[PDB]
């Protein structure tokens, strides 16, 4: 439904709730074939520009085929071993003798066809381009004579159009050592992508999800080059499978919480750690530290579980009570009081300290609040921009309801002198033990 926010003054953090999530849990591989032409073009007396243009485009086809052949001859490097194993196993199955003959027989009459491999997977094979039919029917009888016959310019243009997709696919597979991502329209047309989504063994809500956010689906897919053998170019497209759809998700924004003394040597700082996207998954929480593992579209979010962390759900209680030992809520500490701002989903957190000019001007009315020293938050209702020093941030104007959850900033509960400020990343219980160790350090002396 409606996305809402809750800013926690106690922890200098904001949580954006209400997002409907789609987490990637599986891969669906599919074989995409291009029927190529094995030809031995032979020398004719040619001079006129049409014969040269045909032979030029024909040479770009021959060099593209030999370049793609040496690409499978020497492509041992792997870009991401943890995410292309499922497709690499299919290319290794295809490298067996007679398996390519199998897919060549099943896709003899239709563009799409299911093939049962010998290792059991039922993969979907698709012939998206047929250059062998065009070369064997329209080009070889014109340029395989004793002297070349003069072809009309319509054939030259239609052949540059058909050969272009081959040259661009060979370009992408060559510069990236056979593994390209995202999957471009050269790799897979929008018509082929929607038909492949429609033909997947997934729910209709999942086909509608991938179909209205096809660009996000493309950014989370891989294209792996298999083999060129017997006038066939085959490559596997690895598409994301969202086994969890419409799941509740939360977004944490964090900012430094310092004391407001006039002496940089008497101030201590603290910032909540593990900021990012949190999503519900089977009774637990999946945390995504990397920023590119979650693409967001409107209310919807599309995340990838390959590089994520599974934590108990009590970690969300760190947003309302961080000093609670029931969950070891981790923080980072320092003695560096530098100003910053974080634009949240429905507003903006501002940490202002020292000699710094913090303001929130509006395009239609001037500055309505000049922030004082400390950590604060502002809703997007009526606020357009936030200025911190000589830096200007923009507040997201999406409509929704913010809730200000009052509480005292926790930085006032710490003695500055015995604070561990160099300890960097640290659990709450680690800091509390460091404070019990400093009281043991004071009793004896």
């Amino acid at each position, epitope marked *: 439904q409606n996305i809402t926010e809750e800013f926690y003054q106690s922890t200098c953090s904001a949580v954006s709730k209400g997002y409907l999530g789609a987490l990637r849990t599986g891969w669906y591989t599919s074989v995409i074939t291009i029927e190529l*032409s094995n030809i031995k073009e032979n020398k004719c007396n040619g001079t006129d520009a049409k014969v040269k243009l045909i032979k030029q485009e024909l040479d770009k086809y021959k060099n593209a085929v030999t370049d793609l052949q040496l690409l499978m001859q020497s492509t041992p490097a792997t870009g991401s071993g943890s995410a292309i194993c499922s497709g690499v196993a299919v290319c290794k199955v295809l490298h067996l003798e007679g398996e390519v003959n199998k897919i060549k027989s099943a896709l*003899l009459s239709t563009n799409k066809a299911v093939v049962s491999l010998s290792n059991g997977p039922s993969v979907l094979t698709s012939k998206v381009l047929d250059l062998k*039919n065009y070369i064997d*029917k329209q080009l070889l009888p014109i340029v395989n004579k004793q002297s070349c016959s003069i072809p009309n310019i319509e054939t030259v243009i239609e052949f540059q159009q058909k050969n272009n997709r081959l040259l661009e696919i060979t370009r992408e597979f060559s510069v990236n050592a056979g593994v390209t991502t995202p999957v471009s329209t050269y790799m897979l047309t929008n018509s082929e992508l929607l038909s492949l989504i429609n033909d997947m063994p997934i729910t209709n809500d999942q086909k509608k999800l991938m179909s209205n956010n096809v660009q996000i689906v493309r950014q989370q897919s891989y294209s792996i080059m298999c083999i060129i053998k*017997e*006038e066939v170019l085959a490559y596997v497209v690895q598409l994301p499978l969202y086994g969890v759809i419409d799941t509740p998700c939360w977004k944490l924004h964090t900012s430094p919480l310092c004391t407001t003394n006039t002496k940089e040597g008497s101030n201590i700082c603290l910032t909540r750690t593990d900021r990012g996207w949190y999503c519900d998954n089977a009774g637990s929480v999946s945390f995504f530290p990397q920023a590119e593992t979650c693409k967001v579209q409107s209310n919807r979010v599309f995340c990838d579980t390959m590089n994520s962390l599974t934590l108990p759900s009590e970690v969300n209680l760190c947003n309302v009570d961080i000093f609670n030992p029931k969950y070891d809520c981790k923080i980072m500490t320092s003695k560096t009081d530098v100003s910053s701002s974080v634009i949240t989903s429905l507003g903006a957190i501002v940490s202002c300290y020292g000699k710094t000019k913090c303001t929130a001007s509006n395009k239609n009315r001037g500055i309505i609040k000049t922030f004082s020293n400390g950590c604060d938050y502002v809703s997007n209702k009526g606020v357009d921009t936030v200025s911190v020093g000589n830096t200007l941030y923009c507040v997201n104007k999406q409509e929704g309801q913010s809730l200000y959850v009052k509480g005292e900033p926790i930085i006032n509960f710490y003695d500055p002198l015995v604070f561990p400020s160099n300890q960097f990343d640290a659990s709450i219980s680690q800091v509390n033990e460091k404070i019990n160790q400093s009281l043991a350090f004071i009793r004896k002396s």
Partner: single-chain antibody
Amino acid sequence: EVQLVESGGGLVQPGGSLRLSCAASGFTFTTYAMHWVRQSPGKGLEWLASISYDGTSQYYAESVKGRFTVSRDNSKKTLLLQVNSLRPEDTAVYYCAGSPSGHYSWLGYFYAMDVWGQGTVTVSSGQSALTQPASVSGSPGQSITISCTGASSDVGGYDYVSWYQQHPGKAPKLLIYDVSDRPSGVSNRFSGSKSGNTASLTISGLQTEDEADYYCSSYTSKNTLIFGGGTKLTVL
């Protein structure tokens, strides 16, 4: 022992459908391309169809397009030709033939035929775009030459002309491929040439085994195959 054997035929009704097939033994199928060629009694040869090593491409002659379809099961090692809408003018001996080029699919890369079969009869009771001579008398120990005349699209434009020796009531054997090259088992005396629109096969030191009928074929620029009339050599 590269052996092809034809099957299906006998007597049949003018109308309905009819299936003909072939069998492969002595060679590797996935490397050979196939041909169907027929011959009315006491008449010349006529091309029909051809399929590539993978059965993907399949290109026919115009006179028979539609009523005929050629298929192949590489797993079971056979070649099939289905006949629909049989006509009284279709009664002929149907031959199975092969061509040695593999991994290629354009009809120009396997336009010659070197392996043949016995032939099966298809009879129903109630044709040469190339041109050769018929009468060619030759006394032994002399040299006579046969004229296969085409017109630019065939023979002329393409240095793609083949020559075959067929003995009365037997399979055709290959003599010349490309324009002058010959396969094994072929006597030196067999030798062929080309000059513009006309190719010519020459034979010197005539023997008795050589009294026979002889044919020519070429790629056609129309993606088909054209067969000549057939010349009767008489030894004296």
